[PDB]
């Protein structure tokens, strides 16, 4: 069930309340939540 919400979550200067993960070393289990934030090692030379 989907519906657009611009009444609230798009501010005058833009919204900065919601986030997402760009690229993850491991995949995601079906129905599992990812709440772990860390500097993802894109290459070698650990961060």
Partner 1 sequence: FKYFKIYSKHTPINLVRDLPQGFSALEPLVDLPIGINITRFQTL
Comparing CB distances to partner 1, the nearer of 4 and 36 is 36
Query: Is residue 40 a contact partner of residue 34, using CB atoms and an 8 Å limit?
Result: no
29 binding partner 1? (CB under 8 A): yes
- Give the largest Cα separation in the chain, rounded: 45
Query: Nearest to residue 22, comparing CAs of 43, 32, 44, 37?
Result: 37
Comparing CB distances to partner 1, the nearer of 4 and 26 is 26
Give the residue, chosen from 1, 2, 7, 33, that forms a contact with partner 1 under the rule CB under 8 A.
33
Residues engaged in binding partner 1 (CB under 8 A): 29, 31-33
């Amino acid at each position: 069930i989907a519906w657009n919400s611009n009444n609230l979550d798009s501010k005058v200067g833009g919204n900065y309340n919601y986030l997402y993960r760009l690229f993850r070393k491991s995949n995601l289990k079906p129905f599992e939540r990812d709440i772990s934030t860390e500097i993802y090692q894109a290459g070698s030379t650990p961060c």
